[PDB]
């Protein structure tokens, strides 16, 4: 995920009015207003674009290099029989009290 010259295709938000709620997603790109004056949809003084971006380069240190994250989350609402793991059965014998 890193290119010499900069991989500017990975964004992240750093300005928001309030903290996110668990498992909430926000993809809006409206202009954050830091002061008390409206700016009506144009950056400038006290109004910032909310999305920054990682300029990934291969000559970075561990801690500034890209890491791929996958989060698995399990769900038990009410269903009787659902996705479950694999088992391995036993051989079937005959002519013996088993």
């Amino acid at each position: 995920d890193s290119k010499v010259s900069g991989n500017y295709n990975y964004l992240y938000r750093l300005f928001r009015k309030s903290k996110l709620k668990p498992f909430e997603r926000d993809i809006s790109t409206e202009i954050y207003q830091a002061g008390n004056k409206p700016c009506n949809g144009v950056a400038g003084f006290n109004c910032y674009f909310p999305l920054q971006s990682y300029g990934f380069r291969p000559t970075y240190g561990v801690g500034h290099q890209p890491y791929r994250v996958v989060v698995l989350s399990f769900e038990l609402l009410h269903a009787p029989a659902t996705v479950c793991g694999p088992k391995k059965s036993t051989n079937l014998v005959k002519n013996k009290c088993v």
């Binding site: 830091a34 002061g35 003084f45 910032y48 920054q52 970075y60 240190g61 500034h64």
Partner: protein, 597 residues
Amino acid sequence: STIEEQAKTFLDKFNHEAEDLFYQSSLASWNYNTNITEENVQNMNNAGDKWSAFLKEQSTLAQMYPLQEIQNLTVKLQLQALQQNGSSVLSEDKSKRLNTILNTMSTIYSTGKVCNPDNPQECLLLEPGLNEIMANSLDYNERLWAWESWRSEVGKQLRPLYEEYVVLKNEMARANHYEDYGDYWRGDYEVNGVDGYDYSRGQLIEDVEHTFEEIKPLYEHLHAYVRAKLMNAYPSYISPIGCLPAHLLGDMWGRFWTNLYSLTVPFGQKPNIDVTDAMVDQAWDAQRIFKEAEKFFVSVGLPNMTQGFWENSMLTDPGNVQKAVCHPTAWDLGKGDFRILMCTKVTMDDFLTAHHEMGHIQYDMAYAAQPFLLRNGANEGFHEAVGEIMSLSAATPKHLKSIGLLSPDFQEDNETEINFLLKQALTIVGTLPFTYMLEKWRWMVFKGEIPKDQWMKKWWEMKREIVGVVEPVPHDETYCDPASLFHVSNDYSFIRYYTRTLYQFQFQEALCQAAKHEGPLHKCDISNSTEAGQKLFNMLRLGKSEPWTLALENVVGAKNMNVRPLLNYFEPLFTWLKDQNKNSFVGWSTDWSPYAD
């Protein structure tokens, strides 16, 4: 919202964009410095101009947050570091004229040529040849010629430029509420509103003048010893009760006395430790040196090297054709990218320079978590002191014979210890009067206490009185001997070299008591002790977050700079010199001059 939460939100965006742009510019600069071509010179200049334009725009944007309503001192430190106009408070005409005279003065210093009276087609620059005559020659007349001609041909060109530079710089500094340019320079040591760690700008002068009053009894005995030793190389040219002629001191200005060692060696039949044949005979290369340095640093409890340091650094001179400035520097490109650029041979001075530069690398690795603007030393004297104590500790016979470079027994004698202490005194002690006197002259000139028709008079009166050296030829007000030094004609402050020399020995004595050393101070090795490492790391990790009077206290235990550790370091040499000057005359008289006869 007030006005303090908006400054924080501004500082966030600034930090993110500034870090990105600075990494780009530093990568361009490195790519040029390690591989000199023509397109690299422009690929680097574009990034430099982009960075400077971004910095200027953000600096004019940061003015809209008044510094009176900020209560956090970290936010206030960052804003005050970003709000300073510096230049650009002058008109356009005045700024252009100032940059013009700066470039002219630098060019005159760099390309000035002086040649022979008997062969006018043999002209010598300073760098290749004048400070090679002044370093190696033992001819009185040739040294006199090289000393006089450099100041009479190139120094006289710098006077009408320096006179205008002073005025323009004072005008720039007074528009920033600073009273003069010298106060602007002293403003690096200022601390405001910490309630116990404050520091004025006029307090630096008092501190410097009170610490210099205690180095005089050691410098006087060193001066008398060097004088009695020079009265054998140049008989019938030095007076046993007078000052020293300025052209016999070892280099063009007399900044270091280190080249007088062959003349003033105490016991010249005892060669001092130099493990260079053992390195070559044990098959050491440029990587073994840096592995040993990294091992020394990890011994006290400090981290390894970042694994991007071994792949990206340039530790040897690139062979085929890859023209590169071979000057040891530690690079801090940002974003976790630490590199060292140096072209090492297999010697002992390179073995010590490795430790010196890895000290800088460790200091940079320490404070890498601070905000972008708070990533530096506590003041201008901290980084080089931290780098210098490492080469102090790595060069002792105790350390060298634990590596394997000295024979396992190697009984030491006191004569070689005196040799070593004297060789160290010619570089460390011989430069403090020079530095103090030069910066004092510049301060008094910027302040206006020396009118422009008494510059050379006061220069040479102070050189006779404080330093104890006399000129061999009179100099009227058409000369400029200060401007003939690099730091004066190139607009650099000079007091960092004085405070660094004191912080260095304060740090070393503070770290030698945590390692539980017992002998004299010049024998201390802080390796294998994790308490000294922790004391040092407690200061390395701060950066410019806290006042320098606090960062100093975290290692030493005091708030102000002290000179007693230096005299403690040089005590044995002091006793030896005190016994060697029994029939000499300690001191000098400001009346004798080499021409007044």
